[PDB]
Amino acid sequence: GSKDIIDVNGITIDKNAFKVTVNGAEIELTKTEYDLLYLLAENKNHVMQREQILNHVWGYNSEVETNVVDVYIRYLRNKLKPYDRDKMIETVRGVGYVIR
């Protein structure tokens, strides 16, 4: 049972590095969800295809099934719903996903 946030010698360190700041609060993510969010945010207004998302977040050779992108888009949306940000991740039926 590792302590969530630690302060020592004036330094603040969180057990989970993968948080994002929203409305003065923090959404807590996994590495994969955080990387997906960053990738979509970095490409705002530029639709990303499921396979290029797979390549960036999971790796170009990845043996993972491509639908893991959909699985995680849904994990991400569920993380953003309590903060009324989920609708920012939209589906382009047939292509992939985009933040606008």
Q: Enumerate binding residues for a copy of itself (CB under 8 A).
A: 2-3, 6, 8-13, 15, 17-23, 27, 31, 34, 37-38, 41-42, 44, 85, 88, 99
Instruction: Please report where in the chains the tokens 């893991």 appear, as a residue.
Output: 68
Structure tokens that stand for 12 in this block: 């603040």
d(CA 59, CA 77) in angstroms, rounded, equals 22
Q: Which is nearer to a copy of itself, 65 or 84 (CB)?
A: 84
d(CA 46, CA 68) in angstroms, rounded, equals 21
In the complex, minimum distance from the CB of residue 65 to a copy of itself, in angstroms, rounded to a whole number: 26
Q: Which is nearer to a copy of itself, 65 or 83 (CB)?
A: 83
In the complex, minimum distance from the CB of residue 21 to a copy of itself, in angstroms, rounded to a whole number: 5
Q: Enumerate residues 6+ apart whose C-beta is below 8 A from 46.
A: 98
